[PDB]
Symmetry: C2
Subunit: 116 residues, 2 copies
């Protein structure tokens, strides 16, 4: 069951990587943004604080994930308007359908792995 | 369930890393040395062949796990005296003792994690 768990993680991790060019860190971050950012803009700084705390990653590794997500069009960003130093992240409606598709696919691959 | 699994994996990895200075890849390989070089010295080029076959890891990956397991004195190697200067890997009785103590401890921690 240790070895079992190792096979699950490797298979799962290869699947996500070959299919969506994301890591599990990426999916952990994306899932956070769903809870804290559903069609409501959130300041990076505030999100990074919640995120570092909840997922025990470095600030540095989170920004890698956040950049990758926005680069791959799974998460949105906005600057300004008033203050050109406050950046905001958010999930729009297409980001959300994408989120629903990625996780149904990924969670269902995990259900299968959890048997064989 | 996705984030659950991620949490489990993060915690197990960190436990193995902090307490044993090993990775999951290592444990997997060690488990594999236990199904193959418990009773015989085994030729390393022969181990890897059946290792990649059964674990699907990078040859490049395996050679670093093996070497770490020997450096950590959880696996043993010897150099043919006879005609080749080829390398054999094997588990001795101290190694097998360390193997059972290691897997007992890690399986028990995994068991704890799989309840929360």
């Amino acid at each position: 069951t240790l070895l079992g768990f190792y096979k699950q993680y490797k298979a799962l991790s290869e699947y996500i990587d070959k299919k969506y060019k994301l890591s599990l860190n990426d999916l952990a971050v994306l899932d956070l943004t769903m809870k804290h950012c559903k069609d409501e803009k959130v300041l990076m700084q505030s999100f990074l604080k919640t995120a570092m705390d909840e997922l025990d990653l470095s600030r540095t590794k989170l920004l890698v994930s956040i950049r990758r997500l926005i680069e791959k069009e799974r998460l949105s960003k906005v600057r300004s308007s008033k203050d050109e130093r406050k950046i905001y992240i958010y999930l729009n409606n297409d980001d959300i359908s994408k989120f629903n598709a990625l996780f149904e696919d990924v969670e269902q691959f995990l259900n299968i792995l959890e048997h064989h």
